Structures are given as C-alpha cells and as structure tokens.
Amino acid sequence: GSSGSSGRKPRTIYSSFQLAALQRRFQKTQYLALPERAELAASLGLTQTQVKIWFQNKRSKIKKSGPSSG
C-alpha cells in the first residue's frame, strides 16, 4: 500500500522458545481467553498485541488445508 511489510532474515519473526509454546498452545485451541492469551505474553515474555497477531495470522496460514481460503 504505502510502505510494504517486506524483509528477509534467518531469525524467524519469533524465537523457538516463544514459538514452541505458542504453536503448542494454538493446536489446543484457536482462541485464547483473557488469562490464557496473557499467559503466553507473560510467560514467553511477549505482549497481548504480539500473541494476538500471531494467533490471527496463523489461522490464515494454517499448515492444515481446508478452512483456509483460496
């Protein structure tokens, strides 16, 4: 649109430690309650604004085929 979110780096947008728990939590449920979403931000050391976009984006890029659009 204006700036464009582009870039290439070996360090995934998220660390292995943060991801592990994240993905491990997502598989359980796509949505996270109040204290549930904060748990990842307080545990992984991230913020609700980060764990939120991570859970949302994923839903769109769900390795699993079916619900995703095309």
From Swiss-Prot:
Post-translational modification: Phosphorylated. Phosphorylation by CaMK2 increases its protein stability.
Annotated DNA-binding residue span(s): 8-64
Superkingdom of the organism of origin: Eukaryota
Compartments in which it is found: Nucleus
Protein task: Transcriptional factor involved in bone development. Acts as an immediate early BMP-responsive transcriptional activator essential for osteoblast differentiation. Stimulates ALPL promoter activity in a RUNX2-independent manner during osteoblast differentiation. Stimulates SP7 promoter activity during osteoblast differentiation. Promotes cell proliferation by up-regulating MYC promoter activity. Involved as a positive regulator of both chondrogenesis and chondrocyte hypertrophy in the endochondral skeleton. Binds to the homeodomain-response element of the ALPL and SP7 promoter.
Subunit structure: Interacts with XRCC6 (Ku70).
Similarity comment text for this entry: Belongs to the distal-less homeobox family.
Record's disease association: Split-hand/foot malformation 1 with sensorineural hearing loss, autosomal recessive: A disease characterized by the association of split-hand/foot malformation with deafness. Split-hand/foot malformation is a limb malformation involving the central rays of the autopod and presenting with syndactyly, median clefts of the hands and feet, and aplasia and/or hypoplasia of the phalanges, metacarpals, and metatarsals. Some patients have been found to have intellectual disability, ectodermal and craniofacial findings, and orofacial clefting.
Record's protein name: Homeobox protein DLX-5
Upper lineage: Eukaryota, Metazoa, Chordata, Craniata, Vertebrata
Parent-protein start and end of this portion: 138 to 194 of 289
